[PDB]
RNA sequence: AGCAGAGUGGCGCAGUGGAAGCGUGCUGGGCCCAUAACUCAGAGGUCCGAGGAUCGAAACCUUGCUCUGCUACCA
RNA sequence: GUCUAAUUAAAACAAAGCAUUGUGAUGGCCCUAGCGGGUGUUGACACAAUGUGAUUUCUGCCCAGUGCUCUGAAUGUCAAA
RNA sequence: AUAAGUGGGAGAUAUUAGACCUCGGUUUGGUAUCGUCAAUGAAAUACCACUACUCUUAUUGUUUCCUUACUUACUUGAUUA
RNA sequence: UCUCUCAAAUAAUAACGGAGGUGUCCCAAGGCCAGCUCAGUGCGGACAGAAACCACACAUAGAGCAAAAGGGCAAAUGCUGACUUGAUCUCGGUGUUCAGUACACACAGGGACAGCAAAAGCUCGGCCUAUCGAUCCUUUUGGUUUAAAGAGUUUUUAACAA
């Protein structure tokens, strides 16, 4: 659920509009939260996807898809070579698992128009630049 | 006290012709959502970050200017008139008397 | 609890409400009543239920109306068979009692003319008013063009103080198509007297004088 | 927010207690408990009570002998 | 602004559509030597205001005054 | 007995004594965002929280106000679901 | 008479005879029974309610909801469980 | 914010200068017309005295016009009857403040429509001089008008005028 603040019972030091502890929410899926301390113990398996069986009140059930990129059945078969590329090492903290991609928010169009055009970080970037061509 | 009466002939743009009409206290009518600025104001607020618009306060305005509503009974069309302002209205007045006894 | 014919828990169709004649076992022409509720209309309040319907067709009526006549008006009502009488019958109708088969207060209905108002609430006031019979202008007697209403049907409603009405809309030995139009015709001038309630009518009914009581949509 | 209709006594029962083999009369009464519900044992209602009556009184000893001795029932 | 409650003889308080009542105070009589106490007799009503309803309003309704408590609102 | 190292060593502070407060532990009081933990390898003759300040003597009246409290009439007022 | 009220109202029920009918039945006359009316009031109640009041009960569904039963959830405690 | 004075005779003109007032009051104390004559005094009139009502003569405003004060007024601007709602609608100007701007209030008009009186005339509040408030926003009233961006319809909603 909601990620509590790490606040020191001390008054939020500051703005009245940074003082919600409680009601401060993951801007990250629960799936995701999942993948990525499932990865750090298994650095060797690289992540695909997260889906879910089952859920009662302190916890979620997910299973979670790991490949064997050492594995030369995983190397050997060629539609997913492509897993065992170094592009891959952690997909999970770069949101490039399912549960990520949507937690990062890349949708085609409008809705998402920031944030599409720059993957989050990247859109304010491209709009906050004085682009200084040379013959002014 | 302004007393008014509670009918007045005055002038009517559909009639175009000066005819009777009911004179009516307009007052102030509930607040509504979902005004413009109401539908707004509220997402502003949205919480933490602690009443956005000014509390105005330091009221010294003892009175209102009084509108009537005044309908014409031919065309039902309606007029509004504003008057000066005063403490206490009041409509078929209990309109007060020439040279009245005190009695005995 | 209703006898076999109708069902009290169903809504009977205006279509489904011609079938009163079933609810005259009584050998005899039992009248048909159109009984309606009214829900909010606040009846202490300027909220007054009056109005005047002529029904189509007749509620079975042997009506006696009662003029005092000024002027042309005596004679307008003269040709429309009244009774005819001018002002100097407040004089014979109160006081006393007539004689042999007639009572002094042998009419049905009663009209008093504007110009006569002066007189009868007076006079006539502690005999009529009593009674119900005194003319008001919300019980439009007229009758001249008032009097070939109220001898053809013009029936009269009011709000009780419960803020109840209870309408005779006919004698049930009248034809079923005949009963329909005067039903409607008599809700559709209720409903054009309904001073803005949420729901002013919550239940409608037509129930036959000895018999049971009807539902009606 | 309980709230029990009213005439409480048209509501309980009826019932006669037994008195004791050796003494003469076994029935010293009839009585009035509480109506069985299923959210009210009136059985367990009749056990814990204790009474006296004078021996001599159930005896029935005309001229009693026996008229000051009080003898308790459960 | 929402909602609830209260205002009845000088005072305190009853009253559920037909009527004005109690206590205490107050006035006089009497008991009594005298008063205290008691007993007795009388006096004491825009029923907070106004209007509606109905044959009739403290009563029901509504609006308004006044008081009282909480609570929301906020150019 | 203590202290303002480096301008105040006292009449201030503490202090025994005196009185008051909560609590039977799934508690009281308390920390930590949380997990979990202090008091506590403690159990009401305990632990925690206060106020006044030895001995002697005295401890009056006032809960209207502001705190505090309740097996309290709890369809007052009263949120979301 | 006790109309909770009130709208409209110009009779309705029971029986018997005659005519008509296959018949429940229909028409007509008489007779008996309170009455719209008479009587005289706040509304007239034969003539029924429409709205509603106060009392009571059955039943389903729904809603407010309290108690109690189990242990496999959870919670608290003890042990080479 | 306003009057009188300071303020030195156009106007402008300040000090915690002087004497004071303003947040309202009023369907008349607005608007209009007709009639009247007030402050005050003199002289008569049981009850009536110094003052009650009745009656006449005089009388430049000394009274009265809500209020502060100062201006103004006598067949009224006052007072009393009569009739009424122009204290209205619409658009522009002007004065003050001084950017002679905003705002409020005032002044004179154009276009409506009247109100009153015999009419001429007057009358966009109170005889003149105070009496009250920006945007956003809340709301109402207005035309029943425009938009709700793939089309309609209907709720809702955005708006433009006052």
């Known amino acids: 659920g909601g990620r509590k603040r790490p606040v020191p019972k001390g008054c939020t030091y500051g703005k009245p509009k940074s003082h919600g502890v409680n009601q401060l929410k993951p801007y990250r899926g629960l799936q995701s939260i999942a993948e990525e301390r499932v990865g750090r113990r298994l650095g060797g398996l690289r992540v695909l996807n997260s889906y879910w069986i089952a859920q009662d009140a302190s916890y979620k059930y997910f299973e979670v898809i790991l490949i064997d990129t050492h594995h030369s059945a995983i190397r050997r078969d060629p539609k997913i070579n492509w897993i065992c590329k170094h592009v891959h090492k952690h997909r999970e903290l770069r949101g490039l698992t399912s549960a990520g991609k949507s937690s990062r928010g890349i949708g085609k169009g409008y809705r998402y128009s920031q944030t599409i055009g720059g993957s989050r970080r990247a859109a304010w970037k491209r709009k906050n630049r004085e682009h200084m061509h040379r013959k002014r | ?104 | 609890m209703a006898s076999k014919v109708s069902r009290d828990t169903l809504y009977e169709g205006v279509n489904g409400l011609l079938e009163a004649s079933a609810k005259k076992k009584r050998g005899f022409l039992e009248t048909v009543e159109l009984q309606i509720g009214l829900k909010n209309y606040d009846p202490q309040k300027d909220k007054r239920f009056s109005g005047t319907v002529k029904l189509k067709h007749i509620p079975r009526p042997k009506m006696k109306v009662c003029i005092l006549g000024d002027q042309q008006h005596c004679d307008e009502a003269k040709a429309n068979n009244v009774d005819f009488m001018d002002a100097e019958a407040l004089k014979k109708l109160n006081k006393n009692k007539k004689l042999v088969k007639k009572l002094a207060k042998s009419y049905d209905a009663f009209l008093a003319s504007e110009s006569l108002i002066k007189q009868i609430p007076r006079l006539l006031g502690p005999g009529l008013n009593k009674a119900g019979k005194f003319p008001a202008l919300l019980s439009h007697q007229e009758s001249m063009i008032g009097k070939i209403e109220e001898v053809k049907s013009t029936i009269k409603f009011q709000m009780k103080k419960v803020l109840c009405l209870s309408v005779a809309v006919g004698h049930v030995g009248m034809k079923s198509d005949e009963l329909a139009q005067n039903v409607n015709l008599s809700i559709n001038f209720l409903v054009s007297l309904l001073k803005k309630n949420w729901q002013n009518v919550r239940s409608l009914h037509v129930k036959s004088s000895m018999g049971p009581p009807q539902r009606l949509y | 927010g309980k709230k029990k209709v009213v005439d409480p006594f048209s509501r309980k029962d009826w019932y006669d207690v037994k008195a004791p083999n050796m003494f003469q009369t076994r029935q010293i009464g009839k009585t009035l408990v509480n109506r069985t519900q299923g959210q009210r044992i009136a059985s367990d209602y009749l056990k814990g009570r204790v009474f006296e009556v004078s021996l001599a009184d159930l005896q029935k000893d005309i001229d009693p002998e026996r008229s000051f001795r009080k003898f308790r029932l459960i």
Do not use: W
């Not at chain 2, 307009?26 to 618009?53: L, N, W």
């Open chain 2, 1 to 104: 006290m302004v007393n008014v009466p509670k009918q007045r002939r005055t002038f009517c743009k559909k009639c175009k012709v000066h005819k009777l009409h009911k004179v009516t206290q307009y007052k102030k009518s509930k607040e509504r959502k979902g005004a413009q600025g109401r539908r707004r104001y509220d997402r502003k607020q949205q919480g933490f970050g602690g009443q956005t618009k000014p509390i105005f306060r330091k009221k010294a305005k003892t009175t209102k200017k009084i509108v009537l509503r005044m309908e014409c009974t031919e065309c039902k069309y309606r007029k509004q008139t504003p008057l000066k302002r005063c403490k206490h209205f009041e409509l078929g007045g209990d309109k007060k008397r020439k040279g009245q006894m005190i009695q005995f």
